[PDB]
Amino acid sequence: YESGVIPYAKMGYWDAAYTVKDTDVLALFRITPQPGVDPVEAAAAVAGESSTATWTVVWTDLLTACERYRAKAYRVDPVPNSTDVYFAFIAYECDLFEEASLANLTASIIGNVFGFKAISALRLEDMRIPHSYLXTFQGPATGIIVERERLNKYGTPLLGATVKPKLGLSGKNYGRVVYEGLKGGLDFLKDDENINSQPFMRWRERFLNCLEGINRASAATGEVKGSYLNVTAATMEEVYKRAEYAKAIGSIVVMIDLVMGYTAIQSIAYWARENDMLLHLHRAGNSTYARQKNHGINFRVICKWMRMSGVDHIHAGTVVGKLEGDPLMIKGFYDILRLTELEVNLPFGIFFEMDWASLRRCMPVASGGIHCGQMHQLIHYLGDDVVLQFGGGTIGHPDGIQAGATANRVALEAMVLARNEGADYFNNQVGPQILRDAAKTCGPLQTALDLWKDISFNYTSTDTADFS
Amino acid sequence: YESGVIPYAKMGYWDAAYTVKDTDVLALFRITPQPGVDPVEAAAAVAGESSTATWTVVWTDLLTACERYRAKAYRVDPVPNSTDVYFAFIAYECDLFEEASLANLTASIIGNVFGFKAISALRLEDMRIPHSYLXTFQGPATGIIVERERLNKYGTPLLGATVKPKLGLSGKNYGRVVYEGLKGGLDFLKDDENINSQPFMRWRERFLNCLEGINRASAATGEVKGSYLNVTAATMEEVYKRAEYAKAIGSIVVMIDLVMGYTAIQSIAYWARENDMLLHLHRAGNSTYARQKNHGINFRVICKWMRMSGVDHIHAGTVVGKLEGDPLMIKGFYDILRLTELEVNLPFGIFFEMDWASLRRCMPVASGGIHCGQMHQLIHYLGDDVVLQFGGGTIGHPDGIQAGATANRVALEAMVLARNEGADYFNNQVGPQILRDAAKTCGPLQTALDLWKDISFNYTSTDTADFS
Amino acid sequence: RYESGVIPYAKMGYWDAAYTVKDTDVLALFRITPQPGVDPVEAAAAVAGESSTATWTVVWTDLLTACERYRAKAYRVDPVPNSTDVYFAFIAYECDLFEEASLANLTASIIGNVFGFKAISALRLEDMRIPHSYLXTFQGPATGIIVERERLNKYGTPLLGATVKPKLGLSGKNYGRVVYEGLKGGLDFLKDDENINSQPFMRWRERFLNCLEGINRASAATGEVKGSYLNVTAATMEEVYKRAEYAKAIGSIVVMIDLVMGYTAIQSIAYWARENDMLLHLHRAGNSTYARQKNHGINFRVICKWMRMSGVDHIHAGTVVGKLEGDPLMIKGFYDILRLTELEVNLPFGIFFEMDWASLRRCMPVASGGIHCGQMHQLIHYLGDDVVLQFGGGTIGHPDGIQAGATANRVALEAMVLARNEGADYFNNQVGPQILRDAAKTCGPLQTALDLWKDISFNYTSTDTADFS
Amino acid sequence: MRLTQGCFSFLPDLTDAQIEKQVAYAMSRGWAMNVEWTDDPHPRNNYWELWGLPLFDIKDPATVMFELNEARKSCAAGYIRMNAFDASYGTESCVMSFLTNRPANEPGFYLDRTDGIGRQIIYSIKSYSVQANPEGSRY
Amino acid sequence: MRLTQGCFSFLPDLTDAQIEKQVAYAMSRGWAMNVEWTDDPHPRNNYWELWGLPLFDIKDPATVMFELNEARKSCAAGYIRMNAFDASYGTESCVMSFLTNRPANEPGFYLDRTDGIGRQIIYSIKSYSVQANPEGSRY
Amino acid sequence: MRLTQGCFSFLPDLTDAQIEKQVAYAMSRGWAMNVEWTDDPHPRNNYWELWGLPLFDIKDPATVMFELNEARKSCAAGYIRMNAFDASYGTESCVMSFLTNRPANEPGFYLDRTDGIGRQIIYSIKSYSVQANPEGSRY
Ligand SMILES: O=C(O)[C@@](O)(COP(=O)(O)O)[C@H](O)[C@H](O)COP(=O)(O)O
Ligand SMILES: O=C(O)[C@@](O)(COP(=O)(O)O)[C@H](O)[C@H](O)COP(=O)(O)O
Ligand SMILES: O=C(O)[C@@](O)(COP(=O)(O)O)[C@H](O)[C@H](O)COP(=O)(O)O
Ligand SMILES: [Mg+2]
Ligand SMILES: [Mg+2]
Ligand SMILES: [Mg+2]
């Protein structure tokens, strides 16, 4: 406490003998020190600058229970097969964090440490959110269970589709596409993430025409139907206005984009619970910080944060579609969103044991460049509680939108029926043959299988495991 | 328009002969194609999936003015000294974007393209926001000019300091530290980014004690004073409540954290204009996507987005402090925040010519690991319109907080006085001697210069220029 | 097990001697007196069943739920020492049984029906272990001891107060007079009596405005922050808020509420107090209807926990030596429950569970009723520094006026603490009374008070007593 | 029209052999089965009529098929569905529901439109079968 | 009038021997002492002027008494208070404050009254000493 | 106390030679200079009294010093400040302001506190010089 600079590891931010408490918030960082920076000093610096420290000693620590509030780096391990990169475990006292505030948790955990010169790269890989912090959060407004009860749909993935083209359609035409997709068999459609309100289509025209299409499709089929009406807007006031309008006209669901940001998202998640609305989260912008293994925030952490905030769906990957998704990483995300508790599972990137404290289950959504020919793979990797979304895969069908919709649904039901009978459906013989057998009695599926059979997206992953 | 998959470059998303319109939104991406992906196809894919395209052809394009709404990649250049990395220029029609909506602009420009398997890395480097889009945004609630008029402070950087330790202080003690720093000479102090409301200090206690300290310091000096009261909260409702409280008690200023997100930020920026409040933006989380050169969003783009949204201050780097900041990149950020228009300046990372459409000027803030011994460097790199913040550099002073404050201010005034007289102050002889000459008659400065003279943070930068 | 009909609660899963308590469980300790012929374990299983998921006959609808998770478990049943056919029963309840942040819901389960069960002749809730994870859902004290003392600029000594008397009948103007006099003569606070709300002899607004003149007058005459607990207790939430808002609008530092308002209104006002920068004093009106007798009801220590959770800033908690019931060991336990950051098992004090307070703020105990300054040594010994000592009759009953009464109490206080801090064995009957006489030689008010009341005591058999020494 | 509630209604009507394999799958998971009937096909008709109690750890899928075939003999013309329930923590809900019987002819529904405020429409889905005849006489 | 801030202001002015005993009590609790000065006696003057830093390391009470007598020699006529700080979890606050010095004559205060809405009065407590002269020249 | 408005008030009072170099800097930037006087030191006293008009592209810094010295001879005891104004687009504002004269003795201010709602205080900063005497007679 004499004035001046001393290493973070001498200031109380490194403790190899620290006993982790069940109330602690834990973070796992992948740290790449600058050349010459001690690995333990780097970890202590992340711990200090995300809790109580600055760069020079301050007497004002002595006005506080300083030892309680200092975070502790407690373990630093080399990353397998990754020279001079380290896994650093840090424990944070419960009382550091504002109750029910994602904004506050993130202000500490990600606020400044990623810009420190002394570390050339930093990635938040996982967190243990303690039971006692989780009970301060809502969790899912609806959750998987109540959602399926509202839909009267059980034992099979749900289906969806993004309306295309992305931009340019009028409200009337939007309602046409939604009518056709729903009537052909889809459970949902959705506005594209960038469909908000624009000169070619102001939002009220979209909302009202979509309700006509939705209701028409429900009366034509005897099923509950919906489409994710995008309430994403510039301001909280305008977002609320769009959400209120959707409620007032009877929509089962709305969507929001991650670019709205955490504070707006928590507001809408409370609103959705209060207003009997399903809340779909599109993860717009997520890959700006989640793509690369060396730096940023792993999407599994985002999963925890958004399940806490209380969205009902989140996009979580397809494995076989047009966007990045190593199967081990994806399986990990899906478990984080859907299970009541997590056990350590290093090949899935599950670094901490964690109870979910009975917060409701968040529905993963698999979307982007997928088609019905891959149905066996989607069922295998992703399971029952997922929404499988086919935008181009429905609207791209040469015999029309209802045909696209019908193809996806027949493929899905045929596949689940066979699985439940005990078919080795994931096998490369059996899966595509289940589909061909169904297609012999369904022209739409025959056509879809023929059109897209050669289509795959196989590229090297960036977001990969460190353990096998 | 026959059903099926065709390359994005055959779908209208690549046009080498495109004539850029003054109303277009332009984006510059640093694209790293996966091996075997054509550089032009990658650029067309980013253009398509951020405008109107999906992965397979859709007849529904034909219900729209499809040619108008398609974005166009119009130029693809190799990056200097960077094998198989490309600069890709893309133009977007004005009508794609919701008026006054950062959420909508970002939904398109960053929403999905960073997760595309076909591209191993993607970075948004710069954008040309057209005059006609800028007039839909507020710009700064107050801006540099009105801010200095409210302060009655001209011709010298403003001064600030973050209260430390980061977490643990009570409201009463917070007010003590703010009183002392302000009375010793600082224009401002501020809550730390992670100081919101917590068991050791609930926010109302901080706000009320701080107003006592602020007002005491103003009556002791005859100057306008303030401290950035942090209104960052979980929900828009709670954020508004804290902002309203700050207004009701007479605070000149509040702060917010970037982790609140764009929708909340735009709401508070409108609120700040409506309520005669200075609005300070802490950039919490920015380095999760802004640090690495291969992938994410360059901070210069964030500068544009936050100047549009209308914050009054944003943290923008120090060069010589504890956080990342190449001087050429920093100078570029500062110009983006402060100038009425931008000319192409490739070594500063200014890739587009751009008029700011008379949106007000945003005050850059230089903060983190800086001290008064560096004053010549700070004046040289950063100029007059900046807030220089010394948290540890004030509170770490061995003779107390008022002494820390006084040292910084004497150093600042001495340096500006000498500069205005024509001293070659940036020179390594003259700068530190100006400070020593002032210190001969000011014990606090003598002590501060002695304590921290050996302190530097020299490490290899990650966020560096491509041109010299 | 799921065939129709009646089976014992102990065979339905509500008894498990091998149950491992989880840190997230709510635990309850009940003193159970079974009817003659009722098995002690079955009685405990009945309490566990009927305060969790059971009814009196088997229902197949259990099988639509994760029934094993939700059943509470009686896990330990001990004989009560020296108390034939009475037992201590410990029962564990799953965290998920309870609505977040809701005292009404907690109490609906724990005390709802089981006290009326025919098969048990007497039941008392003695203690609870409220888990860390439930506590974080509650606000705790709106202000708490630490911020309260910062607001008052008063540290290192008990705070002083006084209930205005007579209880009923004074005008608002005369109320403000008593408050002025009391405060100027040295009291930190006065208060409305618990039954002073709004009445034909004094409508509440008259009280509030006149008291603010008195308070601000005393503050200007002394240089101290002063207040009086303006009673906002009213028939409806609407009227209570109106009174609270009015007190805030005119700048009162403090309001009071009565326990008879009930838990839901109390929680509402405790959130209001935090939001409105107000100190919130709780009078425990009605508490002794269920808390007095050892065989049946709710021990006041549990009420302490519930009220600290709900978030009052003060609660009356006993004096030992005054006119109301209070065994010293029981009282010391109440005070610890209100003031400490955590609790260790301390059977002689009635603390049956170890319990972390989860950084919920500290609740200020209030010692009130039939106490006088001749008792100052005892009050400091039993009760410590963080307490409000209230002398109603002991101020206003002083023969030389209200100011003199106030001054006598404050000089006694300061002289006693000065001497304690100096190392005096002040609780010793040879030392404390002499400290008071010594100060009294130079303070006529104190001499007079000592002469009038020094021999007054209230010594009777306690009903709410310990089971361990 | 074809009522497309249930999880296999885009496939042909299931044979008894197909139903039994679905039952076997659910029972192998430890799920409880029940059988329910209705002649109100409305999408919001949450509570179809119970055929006895759910069949909690009955182990032989033949016993579930017996009860389905008893329900088919006793119930009026209309719909029967087969459900599986998972009482596990995290679920405590239905996890499978598919139709085992449907009417030979389902007229379906129309969309009734009431003019609300501005351009809003207040919608009601009306069943042709339900509006014409009482429960037990609709098909 | 006599300013009765502090916890011993209804007792006579403390002698040095008495102050040392209070200091010793606080230091054997492990509390930190500091000394503060003001010439604004207002009850809401939260922040009296610091005399150096609080003495956290200090173990001998005479050291604290030395600093107190240094403050008394240096500061203008007015008030001095002695404080004890407890930084331990659950407190993190002042736990003792008493006046060591007061002016020989304190004129005190008046109550200034502004007519609010209805019968409400808007009150301000004004110091005679502060309204008359600036900091350093008030007593 | 020392009034610390202006940009050089933590340095010693500027000599005429120092002021002239500041003037020269501002005039070399193309900025317009003016001189202003007051004897109300309040932090919110936005509009000090103008000494004539601003000196728009006067080119010789000696002419600015002449006017400053004329103002010093004519104005009552109090404060004089020297300002530079930049009429350029993007600025259109003052870009330099520093004190050229201050009183020999400035008593400074006190903080007047009115009790607002709850715990809020309504603050007014009062000048000792202004409250005692009228403009032109304060120092
Ligand atoms: O804009 C798109 O590309 C989509 O509408 C998919 O359209 P298609 O179904 O026509 O591909 C989705 O937003 C992406 O799936 C988002 O990716 P993720 O789910 O990975 O966040
Ligand atoms: O938490 C901190 O470290 C600071 O309060 C600085 O404290 P010191 O002044 O004591 O370093 C600032 O938030 C950083 O400057 C933010 O970085 P940037 O400005 O780069 O976003
Ligand atoms: O009404 C009364 O008797 C009092 O005003 C005390 O009057 P005196 O000071 O004149 O005795 C208090 O309400 C009791 O102390 C309450 O009891 P407890 O504190 O036990 O709840
Ligand atoms: Mg999309
Ligand atoms: Mg900070
Ligand atoms: Mg009473």
Short mmCIF file of N, CA and C in Angstrom, two decimals, chain B residues 145 148-150 152 154-156 183-185 208 211-213 215-216 218-224 248-250 340-341 355 357-358 361 384 405-406 409-410 413-414 416-421 438 441, chain F residues 1-12 14 17-18 21-22 25 31 41-46 48 81 85 89-97 108-111 113 119-121 123-125:
data_model
loop_
_atom_site.label_atom_id
_atom_site.label_comp_id
_atom_site.label_asym_id
_atom_site.label_seq_id
_atom_site.Cartn_x
_atom_site.Cartn_y
_atom_site.Cartn_z
N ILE B 145 -18.81 21.55 -28.54
CA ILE B 145 -18.99 22.99 -28.44
C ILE B 145 -19.93 23.39 -27.30
N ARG B 148 -18.48 22.59 -23.83
CA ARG B 148 -17.50 23.50 -23.26
C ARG B 148 -18.16 24.79 -22.80
N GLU B 149 -19.22 25.19 -23.52
CA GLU B 149 -20.03 26.33 -23.12
C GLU B 149 -20.72 26.09 -21.76
N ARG B 150 -21.23 24.88 -21.54
CA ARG B 150 -21.84 24.51 -20.25
C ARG B 150 -20.83 24.48 -19.12
N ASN B 152 -17.95 26.32 -19.16
CA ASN B 152 -17.16 27.54 -19.20
C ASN B 152 -15.64 27.20 -19.18
N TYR B 154 -12.41 26.43 -21.95
CA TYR B 154 -11.96 26.53 -23.35
C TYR B 154 -10.43 26.52 -23.50
N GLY B 155 -9.93 25.93 -24.60
CA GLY B 155 -8.50 26.04 -25.00
C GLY B 155 -7.50 25.11 -24.32
N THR B 156 -8.00 24.06 -23.68
CA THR B 156 -7.16 23.15 -22.93
C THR B 156 -8.00 21.87 -22.81
N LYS B 183 -12.06 19.18 -5.93
CA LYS B 183 -11.50 20.29 -5.22
C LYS B 183 -10.00 20.45 -5.53
N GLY B 184 -9.29 19.34 -5.75
CA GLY B 184 -7.87 19.41 -6.10
C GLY B 184 -7.58 19.93 -7.51
N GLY B 185 -8.59 19.94 -8.37
CA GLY B 185 -8.49 20.53 -9.70
C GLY B 185 -9.12 19.81 -10.88
N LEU B 208 -26.56 10.82 -4.37
CA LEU B 208 -26.79 11.94 -3.49
C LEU B 208 -25.48 12.42 -2.85
N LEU B 211 -23.48 14.40 -5.34
CA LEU B 211 -23.95 15.79 -5.58
C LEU B 211 -23.46 16.71 -4.48
N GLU B 212 -23.38 16.22 -3.24
CA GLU B 212 -22.85 17.04 -2.17
C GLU B 212 -21.36 17.39 -2.45
N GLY B 213 -20.57 16.38 -2.83
CA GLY B 213 -19.17 16.56 -3.11
C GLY B 213 -18.93 17.49 -4.29
N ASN B 215 -20.98 19.82 -5.54
CA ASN B 215 -21.40 21.16 -5.22
C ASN B 215 -20.42 21.83 -4.23
N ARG B 216 -19.91 21.05 -3.29
CA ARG B 216 -18.89 21.53 -2.38
C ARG B 216 -17.66 21.94 -3.20
N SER B 218 -17.46 22.84 -6.33
CA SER B 218 -17.80 24.03 -7.13
C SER B 218 -17.77 25.29 -6.23
N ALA B 219 -18.39 25.22 -5.05
CA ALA B 219 -18.33 26.38 -4.13
C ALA B 219 -16.90 26.69 -3.61
N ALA B 220 -16.03 25.69 -3.55
CA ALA B 220 -14.66 25.89 -3.09
C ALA B 220 -13.74 26.48 -4.15
N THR B 221 -14.13 26.40 -5.42
CA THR B 221 -13.27 26.78 -6.54
C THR B 221 -13.83 27.86 -7.45
N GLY B 222 -15.14 28.06 -7.44
CA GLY B 222 -15.81 28.92 -8.42
C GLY B 222 -15.91 28.38 -9.84
N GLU B 223 -15.74 27.07 -10.02
CA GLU B 223 -15.87 26.41 -11.32
C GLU B 223 -17.10 25.51 -11.39
N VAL B 224 -17.62 25.31 -12.61
CA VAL B 224 -18.57 24.23 -12.87
C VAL B 224 -17.80 22.89 -12.68
N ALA B 248 -32.90 15.14 -11.73
CA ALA B 248 -33.73 15.75 -10.68
C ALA B 248 -32.87 16.39 -9.62
N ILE B 249 -31.65 15.87 -9.40
CA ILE B 249 -30.73 16.41 -8.38
C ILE B 249 -29.71 17.39 -8.93
N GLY B 250 -29.78 17.68 -10.22
CA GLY B 250 -28.89 18.68 -10.81
C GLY B 250 -27.57 18.26 -11.42
N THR B 340 -15.61 17.88 -39.12
CA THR B 340 -16.87 18.14 -39.82
C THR B 340 -16.97 17.28 -41.09
N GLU B 341 -15.82 16.80 -41.55
CA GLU B 341 -15.74 15.93 -42.70
C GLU B 341 -14.39 15.22 -42.72
N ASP B 355 -18.70 13.28 -45.48
CA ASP B 355 -19.22 14.44 -44.80
C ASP B 355 -20.02 14.02 -43.56
N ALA B 357 -22.33 15.89 -42.13
CA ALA B 357 -23.70 16.41 -42.26
C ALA B 357 -24.10 17.28 -41.09
N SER B 358 -23.12 18.00 -40.53
CA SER B 358 -23.30 18.88 -39.42
C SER B 358 -23.85 18.20 -38.18
N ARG B 361 -20.04 17.30 -32.83
CA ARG B 361 -18.75 16.66 -32.60
C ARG B 361 -18.81 15.88 -31.29
N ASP B 384 -6.55 19.33 -28.35
CA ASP B 384 -7.22 20.15 -27.32
C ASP B 384 -8.55 19.59 -26.86
N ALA B 405 -4.81 15.29 -8.03
CA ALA B 405 -5.59 16.17 -8.91
C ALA B 405 -4.78 17.39 -9.29
N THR B 406 -4.19 18.05 -8.30
CA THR B 406 -3.46 19.30 -8.52
C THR B 406 -2.27 19.08 -9.44
N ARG B 409 -3.33 18.83 -13.09
CA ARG B 409 -3.79 20.09 -13.66
C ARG B 409 -2.64 21.07 -13.90
N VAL B 410 -1.75 21.22 -12.95
CA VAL B 410 -0.55 22.04 -13.17
C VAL B 410 0.23 21.55 -14.39
N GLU B 413 -1.73 22.58 -17.60
CA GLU B 413 -1.72 24.02 -17.90
C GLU B 413 -0.33 24.49 -18.32
N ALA B 414 0.68 24.03 -17.58
CA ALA B 414 2.07 24.34 -17.90
C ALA B 414 2.39 23.91 -19.32
N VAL B 416 0.27 23.27 -21.97
CA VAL B 416 -0.48 24.05 -22.99
C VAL B 416 0.06 25.46 -23.11
N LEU B 417 0.39 26.10 -21.98
CA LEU B 417 0.98 27.46 -21.99
C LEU B 417 2.27 27.49 -22.82
N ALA B 418 3.15 26.51 -22.58
CA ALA B 418 4.41 26.39 -23.30
C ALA B 418 4.16 26.12 -24.79
N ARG B 419 3.23 25.22 -25.09
CA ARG B 419 2.91 24.92 -26.48
C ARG B 419 2.49 26.19 -27.21
N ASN B 420 1.53 26.90 -26.62
CA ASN B 420 1.04 28.15 -27.22
C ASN B 420 2.15 29.18 -27.40
N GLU B 421 3.15 29.20 -26.51
CA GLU B 421 4.31 30.08 -26.68
C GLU B 421 5.24 29.65 -27.82
N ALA B 438 7.64 23.64 -13.96
CA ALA B 438 6.42 23.79 -13.18
C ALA B 438 6.52 23.09 -11.82
N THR B 441 7.93 24.66 -8.27
CA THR B 441 7.06 25.52 -7.48
C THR B 441 5.74 24.78 -7.08
N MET F 1 -9.58 32.94 -1.28
CA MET F 1 -9.40 31.78 -2.19
C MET F 1 -9.02 32.30 -3.56
N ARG F 2 -8.54 31.41 -4.42
CA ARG F 2 -8.19 31.72 -5.80
C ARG F 2 -9.31 31.24 -6.73
N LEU F 3 -9.90 32.16 -7.50
CA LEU F 3 -10.89 31.79 -8.49
C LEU F 3 -10.17 31.08 -9.62
N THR F 4 -10.58 29.84 -9.89
CA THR F 4 -9.89 29.00 -10.86
C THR F 4 -10.68 28.74 -12.15
N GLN F 5 -11.63 29.64 -12.45
CA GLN F 5 -12.08 29.80 -13.85
C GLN F 5 -10.90 30.24 -14.71
N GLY F 6 -11.05 30.04 -16.01
CA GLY F 6 -9.97 30.26 -16.98
C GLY F 6 -9.03 29.07 -17.14
N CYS F 7 -8.24 29.08 -18.19
CA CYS F 7 -7.43 27.88 -18.50
C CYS F 7 -6.01 27.84 -17.93
N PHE F 8 -5.57 28.91 -17.27
CA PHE F 8 -4.21 29.01 -16.70
C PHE F 8 -4.23 29.42 -15.24
N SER F 9 -5.34 29.19 -14.54
CA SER F 9 -5.44 29.67 -13.16
C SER F 9 -4.77 28.77 -12.11
N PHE F 10 -4.21 27.64 -12.52
CA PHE F 10 -3.36 26.84 -11.62
C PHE F 10 -1.88 27.22 -11.79
N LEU F 11 -1.59 28.14 -12.71
CA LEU F 11 -0.26 28.74 -12.85
C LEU F 11 -0.31 30.09 -12.16
N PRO F 12 0.87 30.72 -11.93
CA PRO F 12 0.84 32.08 -11.41
C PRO F 12 0.16 33.08 -12.36
N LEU F 14 -0.53 35.73 -14.94
CA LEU F 14 0.30 35.94 -16.12
C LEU F 14 0.81 37.38 -16.22
N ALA F 17 3.90 40.13 -20.79
CA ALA F 17 4.65 39.37 -21.80
C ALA F 17 4.04 37.97 -22.05
N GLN F 18 3.65 37.26 -20.99
CA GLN F 18 2.96 35.96 -21.15
C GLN F 18 1.60 36.09 -21.85
N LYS F 21 2.05 36.58 -25.63
CA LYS F 21 2.33 35.37 -26.39
C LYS F 21 1.07 34.51 -26.60
N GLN F 22 0.15 34.52 -25.63
CA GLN F 22 -1.12 33.82 -25.79
C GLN F 22 -1.95 34.49 -26.88
N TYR F 25 -0.52 33.72 -30.33
CA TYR F 25 -0.93 32.36 -30.73
C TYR F 25 -2.34 32.33 -31.32
N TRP F 31 -7.98 33.72 -34.97
CA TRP F 31 -9.11 33.86 -34.02
C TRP F 31 -9.31 35.32 -33.64
N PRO F 41 -18.21 36.68 -9.42
CA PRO F 41 -17.41 35.52 -9.77
C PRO F 41 -18.18 34.20 -9.89
N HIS F 42 -19.51 34.21 -9.82
CA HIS F 42 -20.31 32.99 -9.75
C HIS F 42 -19.99 32.06 -10.95
N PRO F 43 -19.84 30.73 -10.73
CA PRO F 43 -19.55 29.85 -11.87
C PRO F 43 -20.55 29.87 -13.03
N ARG F 44 -21.78 30.33 -12.80
CA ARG F 44 -22.82 30.36 -13.80
C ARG F 44 -23.07 31.80 -14.33
N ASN F 45 -22.20 32.75 -13.99
CA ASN F 45 -22.29 34.11 -14.51
C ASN F 45 -21.73 34.10 -15.92
N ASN F 46 -22.53 33.60 -16.86
CA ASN F 46 -22.14 33.38 -18.25
C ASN F 46 -21.62 34.68 -18.91
N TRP F 48 -20.08 38.08 -18.75
CA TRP F 48 -19.29 39.13 -18.18
C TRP F 48 -19.43 40.33 -19.11
N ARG F 81 -11.14 38.86 -18.11
CA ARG F 81 -10.72 37.70 -18.90
C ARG F 81 -10.48 38.07 -20.36
N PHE F 85 -12.22 33.81 -30.11
CA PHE F 85 -13.39 33.24 -30.74
C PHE F 85 -13.02 32.76 -32.14
N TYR F 89 -17.01 27.20 -39.27
CA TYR F 89 -17.94 26.07 -39.28
C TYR F 89 -17.36 24.89 -38.49
N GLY F 90 -18.16 24.32 -37.60
CA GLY F 90 -17.71 23.21 -36.73
C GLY F 90 -17.35 23.68 -35.33
N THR F 91 -17.06 24.97 -35.19
CA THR F 91 -16.70 25.57 -33.93
C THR F 91 -17.72 26.65 -33.58
N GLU F 92 -17.61 27.81 -34.25
CA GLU F 92 -18.47 28.98 -33.99
C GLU F 92 -18.63 29.23 -32.48
N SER F 93 -17.50 29.38 -31.81
CA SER F 93 -17.46 29.43 -30.34
C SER F 93 -16.15 29.97 -29.85
N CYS F 94 -16.15 30.29 -28.56
CA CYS F 94 -14.94 30.56 -27.84
C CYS F 94 -14.01 29.33 -27.88
N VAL F 95 -12.72 29.57 -28.08
CA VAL F 95 -11.69 28.51 -28.12
C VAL F 95 -10.52 28.77 -27.17
N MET F 96 -10.59 29.86 -26.39
CA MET F 96 -9.58 30.21 -25.40
C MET F 96 -10.19 31.24 -24.44
N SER F 97 -10.06 31.02 -23.14
CA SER F 97 -10.45 32.01 -22.14
C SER F 97 -9.58 31.86 -20.91
N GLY F 108 -14.63 34.32 -1.92
CA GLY F 108 -15.10 33.07 -2.48
C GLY F 108 -16.57 32.91 -2.20
N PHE F 109 -16.96 31.70 -1.84
CA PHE F 109 -18.36 31.30 -1.80
C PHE F 109 -18.71 30.46 -0.60
N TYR F 110 -20.00 30.39 -0.31
CA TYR F 110 -20.54 29.32 0.51
C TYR F 110 -21.66 28.60 -0.18
N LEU F 111 -21.94 27.42 0.37
CA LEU F 111 -22.93 26.52 -0.17
C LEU F 111 -24.16 26.60 0.69
N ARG F 113 -27.85 25.38 1.56
CA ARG F 113 -28.57 24.11 1.47
C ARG F 113 -30.02 24.27 1.98
N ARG F 119 -34.27 12.93 1.04
CA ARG F 119 -32.91 13.34 1.45
C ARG F 119 -32.25 14.33 0.49
N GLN F 120 -32.95 14.74 -0.57
CA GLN F 120 -32.37 15.67 -1.53
C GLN F 120 -32.15 17.06 -0.94
N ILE F 121 -31.07 17.71 -1.38
CA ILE F 121 -30.73 19.06 -1.00
C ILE F 121 -30.81 19.92 -2.25
N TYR F 123 -29.37 23.18 -3.74
CA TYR F 123 -28.13 23.92 -3.51
C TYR F 123 -28.12 25.24 -4.24
N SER F 124 -27.58 26.25 -3.57
CA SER F 124 -27.24 27.52 -4.17
C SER F 124 -25.83 27.96 -3.72
N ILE F 125 -24.98 28.28 -4.69
CA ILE F 125 -23.64 28.79 -4.41
C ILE F 125 -23.78 30.30 -4.29
#
